[PDB]
């Protein structure tokens, strides 16, 4: 029945945590937005923590800045800061990261620059909240997270965390761009100096954000080769894949682990998904290893399951056995008809890495031909020089010549032609380009290229 | 910056000694400079006294005459500020350095505490 | 009816043209009368709505605006009152800001900028104010929540200053606002209090409440004045108005009054009286009697039949301190308890996970709780709130349903999930955790493992009694390491200087171990 | 499947049109494939629209309570200071040039905003929509609204609504129009000849010409300019009818009827919505898309896609 | 309740002690870090708000400050330690942080010649014991009993003048009160003399009377604030089993390394007793305990 707004703010808050972290039931997020769509603030008169529980709650579910209850929890949070404790900032910071309105940018400005002057009175829970929260949205204010870092620094003398808290520093951390050395290494102190409370659900998150960080440094990278020897028995596929991508990323030839976890990736093949393969499979080419054996048999499974495969998918696994030189007529021939109906969902990096991938193995389905070729004018703006070189060398071998295709992809390769002509790695695959097009075609960039440059 | 309890404990002494060389080298010319607001001179200070450097009887009187006369104004026009912290460590300040700086000072804060023209920082 | 008809028609549709001076004369014959429908019309209410948020609202007071809001909404249509801006250079005066404060105050809709600048405007013009104005614009200040202390320090001294030309209820209404603000110097509130000390003839029975509301909200750091306004009061005892009496108590219970001569008297009165009383002032009255340790037979019966009259539609948050002040008396109430659990079963899917937690602790050890429903479905709520449970009302959920017997296994499992990205920093904070995995033994060895290594830094405070009930809970889950073992004897060894049959069966095990 | 983020698990894409149902707003939910047979319209309002070539429903398919959200949404859609999120997501609209005007008009806005999203799958107008076309098939190609001006808003002059739908083969489809606020003569309430949908053995009238700047009266004495003398007696015969709408009634047209509506002269704007339904058995007519954006076809290829779903099927 | 620490500067921990005593730098901080996690794990405190670092090592001593008496808090003149007046700043702040008083009373600091120094003062039933000698003169002295000294039935509050030597330490550190009914005091003159002058001043009075071993440091919380808990150095073995038969319940907190640098257990933590604000004639939820349901 009807209850007050205080009520409505506990069993939202319920509602989002079963929908994160305990099973994705659509008949819950049905509901909640059903209740939510009908539920005004203005009339009640509530603290500023069932306000802020409102709008996180409301935000979650997929509520833009349009809707009346955003709005009405935003004009409150605007006017009345100081009633904003420590408590409460780390909600509404989070809950202002997918909006990017005016009133949203001010709000999350007035958060940061508070933030950075109570940095010396916090403790544990406040500074993990806040520093995941402030991880979330994007902002890059130095200055607050070096006055985080000193104080984490100080904190991590006296022994208070525990994994949870190890594991949602390092991620937040990690996906800032703060490449601190200090804060790593007692980072890494603490963790070590917890025996047997970092289980292997907590110790490989840690591993893949220290790969992802990007310090230099093969010391700790062989402690964390030795420390995951042990377990190497017990994760299941998607640690295994994700200790490739980490160990990818570091960079170091561990070939003795590398061995050990393809004898165990081996054993679990039929639970692997088109999620793992892609990953293990682009893993690998990033790292520069050859393995055949396991690469048959992972091609095998996922033609075993092709329809499961999304456009990260796709541009990962099709990507990788380019590279690699293992041709599956009959994969590709699905994996093209597949790409066919999903031609809208490629971001930038997809339809280029596609393309050019479908391109140099030689197979060019028409279908798929179209399909892809009628897309680039949507994307167009947003590529860089390389990937528009690689899509109209990908597009001269296709053999399209529409104006219509055609058009804004020669005015981006003018738009960034100092670029364009300056890259080594493609200096003969200008040369197809122009050949099957001409001078006929684009007086301005014939005379670019004929130029001495 | 310079550790005592270091790798390098052989000339921590012989550091500090310079440093403080400097400092009075920069101290005895305190005199010949204008101090725009109280906190300047709260900072000055507590850099002499936390690293004991002497300073000049000059610079001081100089120093506390003009905290004198700037201090003035708040108190005798009743508002605009100064925290009541301040007023405490400048009359502690003068207390160790003596009455004699500023003989007026030392009662004319003292009758400012009495009067509670200065409130508290958090408030 | 033919005109009324055409009438409506013209009001629906949108051409008449309204003032809201008109617009709150319909709203006030639709509010008190409404012979003909007004508020069953929904097109003539949205009509009226939009005629008001297009019409200027600057030309009526903010009453009769919070009135037309609050008729509209009513019928079903959100209304909020449009704010107010700054008033001008010219136009600035000590009424025009008190208005704007006083605006912002009654519509419920408040702001920190308009205060700042109403506040900086203020101060240059502070002598214009008339000597019975400051004391509204303190009052004024205090319910905005504005915790700036060198202003309204200010404004005491004026109003000090000017002592005689006020009433009564003004000191009363102004100490009892000073005292809601926290930074303020305790020379002013000393200073304050003398000035209420000195107006005792000229009291009010309602006057009295703001004083004693100001002196609980300050403690026993002004115990004398209390001393004086109570011995004022030995002369009405025969006569106060219940809530007054149980002002009284509550302000005994925070002053810790070391004499109990006068406290006694007090409550012979309020015993015949608490009849009289509300939910909210019958609980803390309830509290302040069992704080001070007079709860007797003769008033706890008088106090149950009062009780019992509410006791099926209990407030949940007013139902623990009851549950907790039965709890600790000796007498026969097992009826009210009955009925408190019967009310609480039915709230079960409102508590928050605080409120269920205290009210499953506070029946640890309840016999005829042994039994009732409350000990499965209560469990089952606490599966799904344990997501947003903390450390303390974890720990005393998880205390009271394993003193309860309930054999959930999975339970207990989740609970420790929970509790091991929390960190413990006492053994009350562990021990509800080892009980509830101790009701049947078994579990994965990782968790036993964590645990392990959890109580082994705890070893070093408990006592010999407490090392015995570690040592119980450790051999029975199955632990094997050694580390945790020899920390426990270390401490054991501490107290007990030799292996002796004294010892129980399990102290001559470890000692040995 | 890629992995979500944990705190964008419950999200919603870009388009609306991607979720291939009615979301859990406004009215609960679909009613069971049993449960679509209480909203059927009595035979005589469907003889009612064959003759007159319009007709209203017997009761309104919206409540306040509703319909005062959907005028929300409306109002937002029209901000000029904070731009509505998804906008690049709309066929065309009137903000385009960033200054708008006495008109405000969005086209496809269902894939911009929750609610109006709901509205498309309504049963009350959907079943009665597959009625009016045969009982067959429905679907949506696209819904447009209507905010005139304060007492300055302009009007719209006589029109045929297939003018616009050159692009269909046969002449199959059926508009349902939403009043969102009362209205009348004096405020933009819809005229409409009862007899123009069938003139000419359904041929196309001329297109009308019009001023920008001319009164109201002007712009509506102008159907002499198009009738001849046969269709000027059945004028006389059938003079043009106005009909006034409360808050929530449904107005049914036919493409091939000449209809306008009046200006607004109360003292605040008015809302209306247009709906336009497709049956089965259609086709398009040249290679290309049919709106901005929206998928190719061939010159004989079905109609069908991703932005044009099915709403209601029978059986 | 609640308790504040400090951590210690690692890079400017001095090289040795004033007696020339080597010191181990990383065993102080070692000693530092154990004696927190003991600290929270008392049952009685409520938590701990750690400080951060700060370079002069005698920041570490923070009970120098401020002195709680009854129901009020105090500050301490500043005479003596110009330099340490920054930090008391930022000290404040914590305590703001935290909710308790909004700023310290300044009483002493006006009494002109006044000279006085925390440590002289131990909280006793509904008392106060300060020890006169080298750091509190006679002025400062009757200045407390003009503050604190009432003499009315039901509502007196007792003050205490205890004189000792120029060579001893502060009273608090080696004459204390536990539980509650128990004095426990060091086993030498210091200590006998303490004993004997406070049963002259209050002979109507018994209580116990247990000694410790000399150069022992020992913490003890006593108030209304009952506690069963006292922190004692792992340097002694004749003090824990005394203690134990005093019927309290010892815990051994590493000091040694913090002893060569002239600072007790004491001088480390401050003790206030916050007094939460009720609004409106409300009372507040109290920490309860006890035995619940006694008559089945």
Same mark, same amino acid.
């Given at each position: 029945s009807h209850l007050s707004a205080r009520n409505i703010a506990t069993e939202a808050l319920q509602m989002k945590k079963l929908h994160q972290e305990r099973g994705g039931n659509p008949m819950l997020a049905q509901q909640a937005r059903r209740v939510l769509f009908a539920t005004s603030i203005a009339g009640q008169n509530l603290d500023a923590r069932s306000v802020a529980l409102l709008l996180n709650t409301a935000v979650y579910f997929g509520m833009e800045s349009d809707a009346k209850l955003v709005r009405e929890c935003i004009d409150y949070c605007l006017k009345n800061d100081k009633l904003i404790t420590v408590d409460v900032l780390p909600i509404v910071v989070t809950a202002c990261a997918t909006l990017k309105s005016r009133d949203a940018r001010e709000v999350i400005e007035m958060q940061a620059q508070k933030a950075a002057r109570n940095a010396k009175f916090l403790d544990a829970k406040d500074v993990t909240n806040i520093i995941s929260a402030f991880s979330? #949205?994007?902002?890059?204010h130095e200055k607050l997270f070096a006055f985080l870092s000193r104080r984490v620094q100080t904190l991590a003398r006296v022994g208070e965390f525990e994994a949870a808290h190890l594991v949602i520093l390092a991620n937040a951390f990690s996906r800032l761009r703060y490449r601190d050395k200090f804060l790593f290494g007692a980072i890494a102190r603490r963790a070590m100096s917890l025996r047997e409370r970092v289980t292997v659900n907590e110790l490989v998150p840690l591993i893949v954000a220290f790969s992802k960080i990007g310090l230099k440094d093969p010391k700790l990278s062989k402690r964390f080769a030795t420390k995951a020897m042990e377990y190497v028995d017990q994760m299941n596929a998607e640690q295994v894949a994700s200790m490739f991508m980490a160990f990818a990323y570091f960079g170091i030839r561990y070939d003795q682990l590398f061995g050990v976890l393809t004898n165990r990736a081996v054993e679990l093949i039929d639970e692997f998904n088109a999620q793992y393969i892609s990953t293990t499979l682009n893993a690998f080419q990033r790292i520069g290893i050859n393995n055949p054996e396991l690469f048959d048999n992972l091609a095998e499974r996922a033609l075993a399951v092709v329809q499961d495969h999304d456009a990260r998918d796709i541009s990962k696994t099709v990507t990788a056995l380019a590279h690699f030189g293992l041709k599956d007529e009959e994969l590709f021939k699905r994996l093209a008809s597949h790409a066919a109906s999903i031609?809208?969902?490629?971001?930038a990096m997809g339809l280029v890495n596609t393309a050019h991938a479908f391109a140099r193995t030689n197979f060019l389905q028409q279908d798929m031909a179209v399909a892809l070729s009628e897309r680039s004018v949507y994307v167009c703006r947003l590529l860089d020089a390389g990937e528009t070189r690689r899509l109209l060398w990908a597009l001269a071998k296709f053999q399209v010549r529409d104006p219509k295709i055609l058009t804004p992809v020669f005015n981006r390769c003018l738009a960034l032609h100092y670029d364009f002509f300056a890259d080594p790695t493609g200096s003969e695959e200008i040369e197809e380009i122009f050949d099957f097009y001409g001078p006929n075609f684009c007086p301005p960039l014939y005379q670019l290229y004929i130029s001495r440059g | 910056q310079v550790s005592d309890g270091g790798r390098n404990a052989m000339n921590a002494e012989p550091t500090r000694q310079k440093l403080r060389a400097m400092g009075e080298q920069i101290g005895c010319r305190l005199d010949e400079v204008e101090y725009p607001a109280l906190p300047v001179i709260l900072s000055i200070l507590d850099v002499v006294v936390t690293l004991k450097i002497y300073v000049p009887k000059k610079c001081l009187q100089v120093i506390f005459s003009q905290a004198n006369d700037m201090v003035a104004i708040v108190m005798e026009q009743k508002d605009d500020p100064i925290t009541a912290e301040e007023g405490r460590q400048l009359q502690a300040l003068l207390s160790h350095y003596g009455n004699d700086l500023a003989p007026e000072l030392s009662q004319r804060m003292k009758e400012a505490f009495r009067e509670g023209v200065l409130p508290d920082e958090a408030s | 009816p033919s005109a009324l008809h055409l009438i409506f028609e013209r009001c629906k549709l949108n051409l008449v043209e309204f003032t809201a001076q008109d617009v709150y004369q319909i709203c006030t014959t639709a509010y008190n009368m409404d012979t003909l429908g007004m508020l069953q019309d929904p097109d003539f209410m949205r009509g009226l709505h939009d005629a008001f948020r297009r019409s200027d609202q600057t030309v009526i007071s903010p009453f009769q605006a919070n009135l037309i809001a609050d008729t509209f909404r009513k019928v079903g249509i959100n209304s909020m009152p449009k704010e107010v801006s700054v008033p001008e250079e010219d136009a600035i005066s000590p009424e025009s800001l008190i208005l704007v404060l006083r605006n912002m105050n009654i519509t419920k809709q408040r702001d920190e900028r308009k205060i700042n600048e109403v506040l900086k405007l203020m101060f240059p013009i502070l002598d214009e104010f008339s000597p019975t104005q400051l004391s509204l614009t303190v009052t004024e200040l205090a319910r905005l929540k504005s915790t700036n202390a060198d202003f309204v320090g200010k404004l005491a001294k004026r109003i000090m200053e000017y002592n005689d030309d006020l009433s009564a209820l003004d000191i009363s209404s102004a100490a009892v606002s000073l005292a809601y603000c926290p930074g303020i110097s305790h020379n002013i509130l000393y200073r304050m209090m003398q000035i209420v000390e000195e107006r005792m003839g000229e009291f009010q029975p309602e006057d009295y409440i703001n004083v004693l509301h100001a002196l609980n909200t300050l403690g026993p750091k002004f115990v004398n004045t209390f001393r004086k306004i109570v011995e004022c009061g030995l002369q009405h005892v025969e006569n106060m108005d219940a809530v007054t009496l149980t002002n009284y108590m509550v302000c005994f219970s925070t002053m810790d009054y070391k004499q109990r001569e006068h406290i006694d008297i007090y409550a012979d009165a309020l015993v015949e009286v608490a009849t009289d009383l509300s939910e909210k002032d019958l609980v803390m009255a309830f509290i302040a009697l069992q704080r001070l340790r007079l709860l007797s037979d003769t008033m706890f019966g008088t106090m149950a039949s009062c009780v019992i009259r509410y006791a099926a539609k209990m407030d949940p948050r007013n139902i623990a301190p009851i549950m907790d002040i039965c709890s600790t008396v000796p007498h026969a109430s097992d009826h009210l308890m009955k009925v408190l659990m019967d009310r609480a079963v039915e709230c079960t899917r409102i508590l928050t996970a605080n409120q269920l937690g205290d009210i499953l602790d506070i029946l *640890?050890?309840? !016999?005829?709780?042994? +039994?009732?429903?409350?000990?499965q479905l209560f469990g089952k709520q606490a599966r799904l709130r344990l997501d947003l449970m903390g450390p303390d009302a974890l720990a005393n959920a998880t205390r009271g349903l394993a003193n309860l017997g309930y054999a959930d296994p999975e339970y207990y499992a989740q609970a420790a999930e929970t509790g091991f990205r929390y960190g413990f920093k006492d053994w009350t904070l562990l021990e509800p955790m080892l009980m509830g995995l101790s009701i049947?033994?078994?579990? !994965?060895?990782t968790m036993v493992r964590v645990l392990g290594s959890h109580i082994a830094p705890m070893a070093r405070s408990m006592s010999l009694m407490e090392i015995e009930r570690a040592n119980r809970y450790l051999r029975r889950l199955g632990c094997e390491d050694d580390f945790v073992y020899k920390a426990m004897a270390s401490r054991v060894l501490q107290f007990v200087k030799e292996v002796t049959p004294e010892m129980p069966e399990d102290l001559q095990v470890l000692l040995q171990r | 499947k890629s992995y979500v983020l944990k705190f964008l698990r419950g999200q919603l894409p870009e388009d609306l049109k991607d979720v291939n149902g009615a979301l859990g707003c406004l009215y609960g939910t679909l009613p069971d494939v049993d449960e679509f047979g209480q909203f059927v319209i009595s035979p005589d309002v469907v003889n009612s629209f064959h003759q007159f070539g319009y007709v209203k429903m017997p009761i309104p398919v919206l409540d306040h309570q509703q319909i005062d959200k959907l005028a929300d949404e409306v109002n937002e859609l029209a901000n000029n200071v904070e731009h509505h999120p998804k906008t690049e997501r709309l066929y065309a609209t009137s903000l385009a040039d960033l200054t708008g005007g006495p008109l405000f008009f969005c086209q496809g806005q269902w894939r911009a905003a929750w609610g109006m999203h709901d509205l498309i799958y309504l049963p009350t107008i959907t079943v009665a929509a597959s009625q009016i076309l045969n009982n067959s098939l429905v679907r949506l190609w696209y819904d447009e609204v209507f905010m005139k001006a304060a007492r300055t808003g302009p009007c719209v002059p006589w029109q045929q609504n297939y003018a616009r739908w050159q692009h269909t083969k046969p002449v199959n489809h059926v508009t349902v129009m939403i009043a969102l606020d009362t209205m009348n003569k004096d405020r933009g309430a819809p005229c409409l000849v009862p007899g123009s949908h069938r003139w000419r053995e359904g041929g196309l009238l001329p297109p009308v010409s019009y001023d920008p700047t001319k009164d109201e009266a002007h712009q509506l004495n102008t159907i002499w300019e198009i009738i001849n003398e046969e269709e000027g007696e059945m004028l006389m015969d059938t003079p043009p009818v106005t009909v006034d709408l409360r808050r929530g009634e449904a107005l049914l047209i036919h493409p091939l009827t000449l209809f306008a509506t009046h200006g607004n002269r109360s003292l605040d704007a008015v809302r209306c919505c247009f709906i336009h339904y497709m049956g089965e058995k259609t086709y398009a007519v040249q290679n290309g898309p049919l709106l901005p954006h929206t998928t190719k076809f061939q010159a004989d290829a079905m109609i069908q896609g991703p932005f044009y779903p099915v709403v209601f099927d029978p059986a | 309740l609640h308790a504040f620490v400090r951590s210690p500067h690692?890079? #400017?921990?001095?090289?040795? *002690? !004033?007696?020339?005593i080597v010191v181990n730098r990383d065993m102080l901080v070692h000693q530092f870090r154990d004696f927190y996690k003991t600290l929270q794990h008392c049952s009685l405190v409520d938590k701990v708000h750690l400080m951060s670092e700060r370079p002069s090592v005698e920041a570490l001593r923070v009970a120098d400050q401020m002195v709680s008496i009854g129901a009020t808090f105090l500050e301490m003149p500043l005479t003596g330690m110009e330099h340490r007046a920054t930090e008391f700043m930022e000290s404040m702040r914590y305590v703001r942080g935290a909710g308790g008083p909004s700023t310290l009373a300044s009483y002493l600091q006006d009494t002109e010649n006044c000279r006085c120094n925390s440590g002289d003062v131990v909280c006793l039933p509904n008392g106060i014991a300060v020890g006169h000698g080298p750091r509190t003169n006679a002025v400062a002295h009757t200045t407390l009993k003009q503050l604190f000294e009432v003499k009315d039935d039901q509502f007196s509050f007792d003050v205490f003048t205890l004189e000792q030597e120029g060579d001893a330490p502060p009273l608090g550190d080696y004459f204390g009160f536990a539980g509650s009914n128990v004095l426990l005091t060091w086993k030498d003159e210091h200590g006998l003399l303490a004993v004997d002058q406070y049963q002259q001043k209050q002979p109507h009075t018994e209580m116990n009377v247990v000694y410790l071993e000399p150069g022992c440091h020992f913490l003890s919380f006593y108030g209304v604030d009952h506690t069963i808990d006292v922190l004692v150095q792992? *340097?002694? +073995?004749?003090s824990m089993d005394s203690i134990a038969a005093a019927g309290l319940n010892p815990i051994p907190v590493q000091w040694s390394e913090m002893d060569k640098l002239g600072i007790s257990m004491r001088a480390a933590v401050l003790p206030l007793k916050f007094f939460k604000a009720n609004v409106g004639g409300m009372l507040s939820r109290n920490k309860s305990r006890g035995a619940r349901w006694q008559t089945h």
């Open positions: 979330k #949205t994007g902002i890059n031609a809208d969902q490629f971001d | - | *640890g050890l309840y !016999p005829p709780a042994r +039994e009732h429903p409350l000990v049947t033994g078994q579990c !994965p060895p | - | 690692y890079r #400017t921990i001095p090289s040795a *002690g !004033p007696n020339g792992k *340097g002694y +073995e004749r």
